[PDB]
Amino acid sequence: ITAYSQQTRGLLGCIITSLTGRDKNQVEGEVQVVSTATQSFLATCVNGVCWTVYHGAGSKTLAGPKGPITQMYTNVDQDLVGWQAPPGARSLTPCTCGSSDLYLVTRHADVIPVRRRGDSRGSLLSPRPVSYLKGSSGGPLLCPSGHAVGIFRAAVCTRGVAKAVDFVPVESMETTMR
Amino acid sequence: ITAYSQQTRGLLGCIITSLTGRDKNQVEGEVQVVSTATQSFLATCVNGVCWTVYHGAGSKTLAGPKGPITQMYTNVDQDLVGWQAPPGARSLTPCTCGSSDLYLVTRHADVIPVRRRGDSRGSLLSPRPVSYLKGSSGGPLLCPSGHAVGIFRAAVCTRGVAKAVDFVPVESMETTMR
Amino acid sequence: KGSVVIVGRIVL
Amino acid sequence: KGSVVIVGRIVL
Ligand SMILES: COc1ccc2c(O[C@@H]3C[C@H]4C(=O)N[C@]5(C(=O)NS(=O)(=O)C6CC6)C[C@H]5/C=C\CCCCN(C)C(=O)[C@@H]4C3)cc(-c3nc(C(C)C)cs3)nc2c1C
Ligand SMILES: COc1ccc2c(O[C@@H]3C[C@H]4C(=O)N[C@]5(C(=O)NS(=O)(=O)C6CC6)C[C@H]5/C=C\CCCCN(C)C(=O)[C@@H]4C3)cc(-c3nc(C(C)C)cs3)nc2c1C
Ligand SMILES: [Zn+2]
Ligand SMILES: [Zn+2]
């Protein structure tokens, strides 16, 4: 597993596209770095669906080629939303090898080892300041085959330091479809 | 993989929707079973685009929830057409593992092993009757990780039994997405 | 000039 | 009533 980020628009561009809801830009890659006027976070494509966290996107539409995309799925119970990924987006396939070696991808395209400890839980192998995971919610947890195990929801801290991560498991993402 | 088919409209439902261009049925799955007034075949979604054969769909629109969807791409030379995939459409992820174990999915939901022989060719592990592969053009070829390698285009036949398959390779689906 | 119509699906 | 906006990507 390896990662690289590319910024595709700036401050003024993002605010505008936010107001019109029409994004003509070429989409690609598996993980979108997304923004509203107030915060920034990630969104991960699994099976045709662009998944991200409700605490980032709230009820919002996604700016797209043909205007705003209305959310297909909104699950406040899971902190989960999804839109139909726009053409170009490269979706991941669900992990089906229940391994416990996972990789979290951050907004800076760090891939960091996290050990799976339960079906929505994993531990980091070295503690991280919170500011280092901040803005990475919605990002992929990955198996060694690069398949999707879930999306990063929250961090678990001892004494203000991150030592574990909580994630919406791919299985619950399948359940919210249908 | 395991695979199963679901019928969702009848003969007349199909002709009518064909005329209106308006389809409100709910769309699930990576592989759609598609029809014009005179023929049936398959479409597969990859990268948020629904793909099929030119000799099947020609230049036709796709019946959809907000009326007729226009084709995003029409590449006659490669027998390739694609529409923006309708909401609910699941996307496969492009294969990147250069594997030679391939599995064709047909309209009957059989998954049959094909041995890769070139960038767009594979031989059937057992030959098949032409009648049994008729109508599965636009179906996917899958690698052992269940990614899309390409879509079924033509069969090579000696006297009525298909011995090998031609398919649109997925690199060329990505190419046509520029 | 008519449309292509989804009449079913293969679930994997 | 603003939209979520793609401002970059991460490629794997
Ligand atoms: C077990 O189930 C759950 C579990 C957690 C939930 C949760 O979590 C809260 C959000 C989460 C967070 O900031 N997540 C991230 C982020 O980096 N976030 S971020 O910076 O990207 C932010 C998007 C902009 C990925 C984390 C990055 C760094 C760690 C920050 C310090 C620890 N901390 C305060 C948290 O982890 C918080 C806890 C929030 C919510 C909801 N919030 C709301 C709204 C209306 C407020 C609706 S539902 N539901 C949850 C559910 C259901
Ligand atoms: C390597 O490159 C290529 C390679 C082949 C191409 C091709 O092939 C032709 C179409 C194809 C076909 O029937 N495909 C399928 C289908 O099952 N088909 S079907 O039944 O689903 C049918 C759609 C409804 C999957 C086959 C199912 C059973 C085998 C039938 C017997 C052998 N046979 C006659 C074929 O394979 C034919 C040959 C046709 C075309 C085109 N034809 C047209 C116009 C002129 C019509 C424009 S582009 N391009 C091609 C290109 C570029
Ligand atoms: Zn896995
Ligand atoms: Zn593969």
Distance, in Å, from the CA atom of B34 to the CA atom of B80, rounded to the nearest integer, reads 15
Q: Which of B31, B32, B38, B53 to mutate to test the pocket of ligand 2 (most atoms within 8 A of CB)?
A: B53
Residues B27, B80, single domain; the answer is: yes
Residues B88, B98, single domain; the answer is: no
Residues A84, A112, single domain; the answer is: no
Instruction: State the resolution, in angstroms.
Output: 2.4
Q: After which residues is chain D broken (C to N over 2.5 A)?
A: none
| Known active-site residue A55 | yes
Distance, in Å, from the CA atom of B30 to the CA atom of B44, rounded to the nearest integer, reads 6
Determined by: X-ray
| Domain count of the fold of chain A | 2
Which domain CATH number covers A171? 2.40.10.10
Q: Which chain B residues have a beta carbon less than 8 Å from that of A86?
A: 48, 84
| Known active-site residue A82 | no
* Contact present, A21 and A66 (Cβ < 8 Å): no
* Contact present, B141 and B148 (Cβ < 8 Å): yes
**How many contiguous H segments (helices) and E segments (strands) does chain D have?**
0, 1
Q: How many CB atoms lie within 10 A of CB A21?
A: 20
DSSP string, chain B: ---EEEE---HHHHHHHHHH-B--S---SSEEEEE-SS-EEEEEEETTEEEEEHHHHTT-EE-BBTBPBPEEEEEGGGTEEEEEPPTTPPPBPBP-S--SEEEEE-TT--EEEEEEEETTEEEEEEEEEHHHHTT-TT-EEE-TTS-EEEEEEEEEEETTEEEEEEEEEHHHHHHHT-
Counting as contact any 3 or more CB pairs under 8 A, the partners of B are A, C
* Spatial CB neighbours of B11, under 8 Å, sequence gap ≥ 6: none
Residues B9, B78, single domain; the answer is: yes
Q: Is A167 in the pocket of ligand 1 (CB under 6 A)?
A: no
Q: Which chain B residues have a beta carbon less than 8 Å from that of A177?
A: 28
Q: Which two tokens stand for residue A159?
A: 């004494």
Residues B117, B170, single domain; the answer is: yes
Which domain CATH number covers A59? 2.40.10.120
Interface test with D, best of A11, A18, A143, A145 (most D CBs within 10 A): A18
Distance, in Å, from the CA atom of A106 to the CA atom of D8, rounded to the nearest integer, reads 13
Distance, in Å, from the CA atom of A51 to the CA atom of A45, rounded to the nearest integer, reads 6
Range of the domain at A144: 93-178
